Amino acid sequence: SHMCDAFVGTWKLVSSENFDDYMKEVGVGFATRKVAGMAKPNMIISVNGDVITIKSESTFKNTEISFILGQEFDEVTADDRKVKSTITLDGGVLVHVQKWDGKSTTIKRKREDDKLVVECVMKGVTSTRVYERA
Ligand SMILES: CCN(CC)c1nc2c(c(-c3ccncc3)c1-c1nnn[nH]1)CCCCC2
């Protein structure tokens, strides 16, 4: 057992707060905000050795990242940003920073009770998304 055992699984979105405001702050356009905001994605997290894979499956877009903690990688986000990302573990929380066009956003994934709670921050705007086991 190891680094991210309590994150591994299939997690389904059950609540979201302020995600439209988060997306506006990020610079996402109107049509993508409306269609992406409808989706109820599954977040599928797995680990093989040092490599963590996080897939997002949704009616909007399917995406996938695989990474090693602390090691920067290229990511294409579901809204089509080309970002440079680094994900670390800080006190048991996965902390994901995306950098692009001189901007930055931080996404934190934490296990709380039987949920995976995702906090998404862009400047002064926070969105909280809660996922449950599928
Ligand atoms: C903040 C990180 N993150 C939330 C965990 C997401 N960021 C984004 C998007 C989605 C998204 C993917 C698939 N379908 C609908 C939405 C998600 C997501 N991934 N998994 N669940 N929501 C695209 C909309 C624009 C902003 C970027």
Swiss-Prot record:
The modification N-acetylcysteine is found at residue 4. It is found in: Cytoplasm; Nucleus. Its main location: cytoplasm. Changing residue 25 to D: In a breast cancer sample; somatic mutation. The modification Phosphoserine is found at residue 15. Pfam families: Lipocalin (PF00061). Gene3D superfamilies: 2.40.128.20. One of its GO terms (molecular function) is long-chain fatty acid transmembrane transporter activity. Disulfide bonds: none annotated. A fatty acid binds at residues 129-131. The modification Phosphotyrosine is found at residue 22. Keywords: Acetylation, Cytoplasm, Lipid-binding, Nucleus, Phosphoprotein, Transport. A motif (Nuclear localization signal) lies at residues 24-34. The keyword Acetylation applies. Belongs to the calycin superfamily. Fatty-acid binding protein (FABP) family. PANTHER family: FATTY ACID BINDING PROTEIN. Forms a beta-barrel structure that accommodates hydrophobic ligands in its interior. This is Fatty acid-binding protein, adipocyte. It comes from Homo sapiens. The gene is FABP4.
